Amino acid sequence: PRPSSGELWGIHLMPPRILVECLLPNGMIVTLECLREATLITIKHELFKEARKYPLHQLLQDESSYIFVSVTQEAEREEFFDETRRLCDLRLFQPFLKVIEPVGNREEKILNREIGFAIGMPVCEFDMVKDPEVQDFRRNILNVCKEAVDLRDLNSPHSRAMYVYPPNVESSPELPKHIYNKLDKGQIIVVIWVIVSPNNDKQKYTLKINHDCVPEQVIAEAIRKKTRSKKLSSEQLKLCVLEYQGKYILKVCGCDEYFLEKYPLSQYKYIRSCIMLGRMPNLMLMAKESLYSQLPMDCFTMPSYSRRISTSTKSLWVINSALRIKILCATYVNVNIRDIDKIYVRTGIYHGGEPLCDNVNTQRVPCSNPRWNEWLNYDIYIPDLPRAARLCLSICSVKGRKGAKEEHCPLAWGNINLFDYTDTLVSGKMALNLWPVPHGLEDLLNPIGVTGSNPNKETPCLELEFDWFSSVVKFPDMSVIEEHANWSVLRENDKEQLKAISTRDPLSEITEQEKDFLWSHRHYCVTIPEILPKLLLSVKWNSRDEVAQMYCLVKDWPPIKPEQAMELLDCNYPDPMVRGFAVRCLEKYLTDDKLSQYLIQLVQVLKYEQYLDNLLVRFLLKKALTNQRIGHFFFWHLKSEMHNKTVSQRFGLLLESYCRACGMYLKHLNRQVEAMEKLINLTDILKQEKKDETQKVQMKFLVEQMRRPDFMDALQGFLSPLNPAHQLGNLRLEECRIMSSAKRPLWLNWENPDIMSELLFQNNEIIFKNGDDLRQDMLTLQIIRIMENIWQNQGLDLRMLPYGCLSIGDCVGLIEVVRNSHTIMQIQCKGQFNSHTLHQWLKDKNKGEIYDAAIDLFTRSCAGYCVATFILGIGDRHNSNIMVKDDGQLFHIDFGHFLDHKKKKFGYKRERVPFVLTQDFLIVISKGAQECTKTREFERFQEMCYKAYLAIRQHANLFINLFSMMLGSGMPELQSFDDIAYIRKTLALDKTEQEALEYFMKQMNDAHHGGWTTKMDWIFHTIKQH
């Protein structure tokens, strides 16, 4: 069970010397012994020296007339134009090299290799593919690439700098009052640093300015304090300020983060963090030119595939027939003939998750002979088919053994668009290679699943035939549809109910009464534009009459909040107008801040798109190519899934266009990818060949490898995939180690090459982990961050710690290390532990005046995690998965389960309190009081929890939407809307807000065995006490 992924096929690491077969242009073969780290310049030179000793030498040209070609592990024949590359880095399949004369388009060949390296797949594979939709995509998407690249060079250099180093800022300038009150008379002390010539001295100027100062104003203020010792006319002065105000730019000390834009200073996330923490902002001033010289020149070439030659019509609505589809035969199934009775094919016609008529089975036939030749009739009229209609099918097994009870299991599934991307109604025979059933999915179909034939061709193959109308049939154009709507043709009680329906959450039950009510009042519905998702679900999508009408409404519909618009991109809203509308909202109202925040989900709903080419993908790609911070994560989220064959054609096509237009960042991404690939190889050796060996032996092997020159080259001097603003310099080899945990994670440390790194970010410490699926943690951490943000904006300072977590591949990832923090178990194990050990530890770490602050920080942190883990239903906490910083911040690690996971395997219907505050925590919060729940401190902590809970509940739409967009994501714990039903329970969405709080209090009491009281009367919830 051990095939190897490494420097060669079947070998992880080339031995220090290796024999390499060289094929000369004259036909001769020469075996050369090479150093595994030797470059191609060296190897070629040695080869041609040696080739003098072999027959037909005279027919060989100058060694500079040739390059090497060979077969790589991806089975591509690859020409090596860059001869500085080391042999061990070539990814050869076998150790041989062929000498050729370089031909063809050299720059394009080189670019394509760089692209293929980034995305994990040779781009020649794309040139192969026959599907019209694919080639159309690769061509048309180039429009988006050119649009962005032009919009980049427009304003140069500034617009190019804005692309590379975007403003990292909050979505609004407005300051919550807990933030504002931290300001001294609405003003902030900032320290501005300059590196002064010749000797690069660091000089410190301290300024007190208005929080809303534009960075240009901050620079003028520094100019004022600088030239103030010198006295001069206030006219020459502010002429001196004016003229030189824009000769400089500001940067954060320690990481590459810039303020290039006239946003208020407190709006930049770094400054806003400094304020809330009472930390000194430290900025570095530098000349605008020394930055704009750093900027690479990005140039975009049209690829050769944009230069190549390529290859009776009736309306859908004139076709008078019922829907009819033929199941012919399946090639094979894997079934145990003795354990199942018969097999058959389930089908359904779906718009989104909803059937447009009831499902239809073929007849049951023996396992051994999967043949039907059955025309299945559906109850719908072909003209009544909506544009997004899909065919959803499965081959199922049926076992009839126990009484009249049967067991139906899906063997394989597939989905088909009833219209293709040219709006052609599908017809004729069709062959569909099917897909494995997703782990945990018990339903006989999988309508959420992607459309299209499984690219693996040894799979069950199901032959179909659709009907033929003796013409090519197209979906009616918009002019036609628009017309048909015009061909169709209390109030205070109604208005209130309408609003009241619109205030509910997405997954709220909508009755048939309410759908008719909604549909009837649909024209007045425009007065409350955010009711749209609910009105859309009231529509009957199997009637062309109602859809045509709904289309005319959408055309003129007022935009809605992105947080709302995003629901329209989930798997429940397949219609191309509807999604278009949703995307135009994001275009108008979605800040880059929110786009970064929600990027995980927006990428995921791309899996739900019926076609490669759509408004959503164009918008995202465009954003990714005009903002490099968005571009970075855009790339890593797509690349991390490229192993998954359901999405890999789509994502690879998207990754190709992105890598063509992204510019010089491609060189940086490739350095990151190369660094991760050495970490994957290294940890694979540890987990495979070295799996039975001691830590000491393994630590000797890790050290000896990391000193290797090819390893140093690759792991030093690149940007961190967790935060590309963090530069990873030289390794600190002495702090690198294999952690004791089961999957053998690596603890890594890098110098921060930043000249100012002492002020902030002196260490970059990262855990590289191979073998666990990090997608669930990553989501959870993201949800925690979105929660923290919600609370801040309400003036609730609950300090969460959503540490960096990034999935880069199949079960491989990076975790950002939190400094100066230990687990509760680690704490108890130093300084014999009673319940008071923790509070004693926290005391020893904060002595004197700073003691109170540490308690305050531990209390707030505590509150936040108590509330969040309740709501999300995180896996149960213990002393190993809870951590505490020396200054008292508490946070959770290792989430790895959430929602309804426990109910599935234990069948208990309950809401857990995952984080139960043991006496140890109550002691800390109470500052060591004897009776901990009776202190005013603990009342304070309760009110925090209460506030935090209702804030999230008020935002329930957002969270529910975010989870809904993950349904097709492959996360076993979130497979359908039932998994999301959990947070509807913990947030008590079907109750009143006051009822919900009562419920939350009750959960806390049941879990903590009393001690959660109320400052309110039972009846009105009004302040009684104090």
Ligand X SMILES: Cc1nc(NC(=O)N2CCC[C@H]2C(N)=O)sc1-c1ccnc(C(C)(C)C(F)(F)F)c1
Question: For ligand X, which residue of 822, 836, 903, 947 counts as binding (CB under 6 A)?
Answer: 822
Phi, psi (5° rounding) for residue 973?
-75, -25
The tokens of 22 are what? 């060289």
Contact between 594 and ligand X (CB under 6 A)? no
Contact between 894 and ligand X (CB under 6 A)? yes
CA distance 432 to 459: 9
Question: For ligand X, which residue of 23, 276, 528, 817 counts as binding (CB under 6 A)?
Answer: 817
CA atoms within 13 A on the CB side of 254: 14
Considering only the C-alpha atoms of the chain, give the largest distance between any 2 of them, rounded to a whole number of Å.
Answer: 103
Q: In what order do the strands lie in the sheet with 821-823?
A: 821-823, 882-885, 890-892
Chain positions 743 to 782 lying near ligand X, rule: CB under 6 A, are 745, 767, 769
CA distance 588 to 988: 33
Helix, strand, coil percentages, rounded to 5, for the chain = 40, 20, 40
- Closest approach, Cβ 869 to ligand X, in A, equals 15
Nearby residues of 615 by Cβ (< 8 Å), 6 or more positions away: 579, 580, 583, 584
- Closest approach, Cβ 487 to other proteins, in A, equals 21
Contact between 1018 and other proteins (CB under 8 A)? no
Strands, E, within 299-434: which ranges? 313-315, 322-330, 342-351, 354-355, 360-361, 371-381, 390-402, 405-417, 428-433
Span from 255-263, 287-295, 349-357, 858-866 in contact with other proteins (CB under 8 A)? 349-357
Count of all residues that appear for the chain in the document: 1026
Phi, psi (5° rounding) for residue 534?
-75, -40
Task: Work out the number of other CB atoms within 10 angstroms of the CB of residue 888.
Answer: 23
Q: In what order do the strands lie in the sheet with 746-751?
A: 737-738, 746-751, 763-770, 812-816, 805-809
Nearer to ligand X, 245 or 763 (CB): 763
Site size for Na ion (CB under 5 A): 1
564-602: string of b/e by CB count within 10 Å (b at 16+)? bbbbbbbbbbbbbbbbbbbbebbeeebebbbbbbbbbbb
At how many degrees (to 10) do helices 512-520 and 491-502 cross?
120
Nearer to Na ion, 253 or 857 (CB): 253
Question: For other proteins, which residue of 334, 493, 832, 1022 counts as binding (CB under 8 A)?
Answer: 334
Contact between 362 and Na ion (CB under 5 A)? no
Contact between 799 and ligand X (CB under 6 A)? no
Nearer to Na ion, 196 or 322 (CB): 196
29 binds, among ligand X, other proteins, Na ion, none (CB under 5 to 8 A by kind): other proteins
Site string for other proteins, 425-454 (x = CB under 8 A): --------------x--xxx----------
Question: For other proteins, which residue of 19, 54, 829, 1017 counts as binding (CB under 8 A)?
Answer: 54
Question: For other proteins, which residue of 111, 134, 195, 409 counts as binding (CB under 8 A)?
Answer: 409
Angle at 413 between CA 412 and CA 414, to 5 degrees: 140
Contact between 73 and other proteins (CB under 8 A)? yes
757 binds, among other proteins, Na ion, ligand X, none (CB under 5 to 8 A by kind): Na ion
Question: For ligand X, which residue of 362, 727, 821, 986 counts as binding (CB under 6 A)?
Answer: 821
Question: Which run of H or of E encompasses 576?
Answer: helix 576-589
Nearer to other proteins, 93 or 305 (CB): 93
Nearer to ligand X, 530 or 773 (CB): 773
- Closest approach, Cβ 294 to Na ion, in A, equals 18
805, β-bridge pairs: 815
Contact between 95 and other proteins (CB under 8 A)? no
Contact between 80 and other proteins (CB under 8 A)? no
CA distance 678 to 1004: 48
Span from 464-472, 786-794, 817-825, 981-989 in contact with ligand X (CB under 6 A)? 817-825
Nearby residues of 597 by Cβ (< 8 Å), 6 or more positions away: 782, 785, 786, 789
Query: With 0-12 CB in 10 A as exposed, 13-18 as middle and 19+ as buried, what is 692?
Result: exposed
Site string for ligand X, 721-750 (x = CB under 6 A): ------------------x-x---x-----
Chain positions 752 to 811 lying near Na ion, rule: CB under 5 A, are 757
| Backbone breaks in the chain after residues (C–N over 2.5 Å) | 311, 489, 831
Contact between 702 and ligand X (CB under 6 A)? no
Nearer to ligand X, 627 or 749 (CB): 749
Nearer to Na ion, 730 or 794 (CB): 730
The tokens of 965 are what? 């967009």
Nearer to other proteins, 593 or 979 (CB): 979
Answer whether 233's CB lies under 8 Å from 215's CB: no
- Closest approach, Cβ 823 to ligand X, in A, equals 6
Chain positions 743 to 762 lying near Na ion, rule: CB under 5 A, are 757
Question: For other proteins, which residue of 19, 56, 110, 302 counts as binding (CB under 8 A)?
Answer: 56
Nearer to other proteins, 191 or 981 (CB): 981
Measured torsion, CA atoms of residues 535, 539, 544, 546, in degrees rounded to the nearest 10: -60
Contact between 1 and other proteins (CB under 8 A)? yes
Contact between 865 and ligand X (CB under 6 A)? no
Q: Tell the residue number behind the tokens 């001294």, with chain if given.
A: 184
| Residues near other proteins (CB under 8 A) | 1, 3, 5, 9, 21, 23, 25-29, 54-56, 59, 71-77, 93-94, 96, 98, 334-336, 339-340, 348, 354-355, 357-359, 379, 397, 399, 405, 407-409, 411, 439, 442-444, 458, 509-513, 516, 905, 907-908, 978, 981, 990-991
| Residues near ligand X (CB under 6 A) | 739, 741, 745, 767, 769, 803, 815, 817-818, 821-822, 826, 893-894
